[PDB]
Design a protein around this ligand. Sequence first.
Ligand SMILES: CCCCCCCCOCCOCCOCCOCCO
Ligand SMILES: CCCCCCCCOCCOCCOCCOCCO
Ligand SMILES: CCCCCCCCOCCOCCOCCOCCO
Ligand SMILES: CCCCCCCCOCCOCCOCCOCCO
Ligand code: NA
Lengths: 210, 210
Amino acid sequence: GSSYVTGNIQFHDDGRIHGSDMTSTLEAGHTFDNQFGGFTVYTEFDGIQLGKLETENGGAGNTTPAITVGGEQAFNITDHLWVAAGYQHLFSAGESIQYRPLVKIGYNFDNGISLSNRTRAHIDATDADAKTDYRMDNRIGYAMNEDVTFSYNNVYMIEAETMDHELRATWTRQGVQPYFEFRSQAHGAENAAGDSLVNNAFVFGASYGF
Amino acid sequence: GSSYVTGNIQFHDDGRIHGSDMTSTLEAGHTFDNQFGGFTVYTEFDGIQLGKLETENGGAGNTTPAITVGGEQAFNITDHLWVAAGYQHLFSAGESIQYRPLVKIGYNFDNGISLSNRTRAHIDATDADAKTDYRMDNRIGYAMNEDVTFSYNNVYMIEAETMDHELRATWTRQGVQPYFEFRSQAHGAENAAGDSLVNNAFVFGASYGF
Ligand SMILES: CCCCCCCCOCCOCCOCCOCCO
Ligand SMILES: CCCCCCCCOCCOCCOCCOCCO
Ligand SMILES: CCCCCCCCOCCOCCOCCOCCO
Ligand SMILES: CCCCCCCCOCCOCCOCCOCCO
Ligand code: NA
């Protein structure tokens, strides 16, 4: 068994999709051990607003944070080919926002390359009765040595047709493992006037396993 | 050298002062050891809204969280008597709210009783030019054994004449140390119509030092 915390600070060069120029995401979870692999539970506070509100021209303004609670069970198919299934639930301001079942598959090469997909349904639980969307996170990671891992993660929303590029460098030292990440977000998103909501985030973060 | 995280979930029976029926406060910091003692830098997210929004009758409604960054130097004067001093900056949504210089004093007894005071000034940093108030935290704590520690903490604002009460039990197990706390807050606070704003909260939290 093991617990873990992770989180970050995000500086946004536009900030409208987040509603603020500075946000934070924090997450804490625990992996119970069974023989299939691990069963992990977790909670994520997403979208905490720190910086100047962005309220005009498509900005989201003063939001309430995205609270996720989630469980996931992973399975090793081979020693290097694994899959998982799990469920996330999205709450916000005391309400159910979405049902989010998810599935994952990935493969880990000996040379330090690893590949993985997460496909996550976004099923509205609110009255807006919105169309179900599907988030895909496709990630390639390179652990060049035991001291640094590099990663590119593509975020794609199938229906909205929006795309995020995420590039990360992680100092995988013993103990707290800080990381820097550049996110090029919201490619495809537009405001009412048809202007681009593209956002660049500089992200400073850290993870710790115990 | 030591790092630490702490955090809680707060369930409120009147969530008006918080704007919400459920909130969280979260905190992380590190202590560097020097000659005088511990120098600790930290950040706190106070007031993350998780529950149904309270907007009527003086409720704060959709707030932005209270962000503290701070630094404190502690001095072990005797093996039992310590003092500390430092500075906290409070901002919210990209705007400095208060300058918060602070001092601390406490005594730890061998029988496991400990007493402490923190006095923190609340200097208005906005254009409102509000009279500087002073916050006292007067805590008594008892470590009955290595498993459970109880504490009482009185919170008092000198000028506003408001008072909080904090009763806490902490499971000091090895690893993540969870805690229950009952809070009765905002004694002396009134909305515009003169009604008491008193809030009672059930608080579940956890901490980890490393
Ligand atoms: C009990 C609720 C748990 C929800 C998530 C756990 C959060 C624990 O970390 C608190 C961090 O305090 C905020 C400072 O942000 C720093 C960003 O870097 C990541 C911290 O590991
Ligand atoms: C139609 C647009 C959909 C976007 C797909 C772009 C994918 C580019 O990302 C590169 C990294 O992808 C890693 C591989 O994806 C998962 C492979 O895992 C399978 C291993 O068995
Ligand atoms: C606790 C904030 C400072 C970080 C730890 C260093 C000081 C440890 O000794 C202080 C003794 O207790 C006084 C703390 O009063 C409550 C602090 O609440 C945290 C947010 O400011
Ligand atoms: C003289 C009557 C004035 C009472 C109204 C204001 C009360 C504010 O003071 C609260 C202090 O009460 C002591 C709290 O006990 C905490 C024990 O630990 C303190 C160790 O320093
Ligand atoms: Na808000």
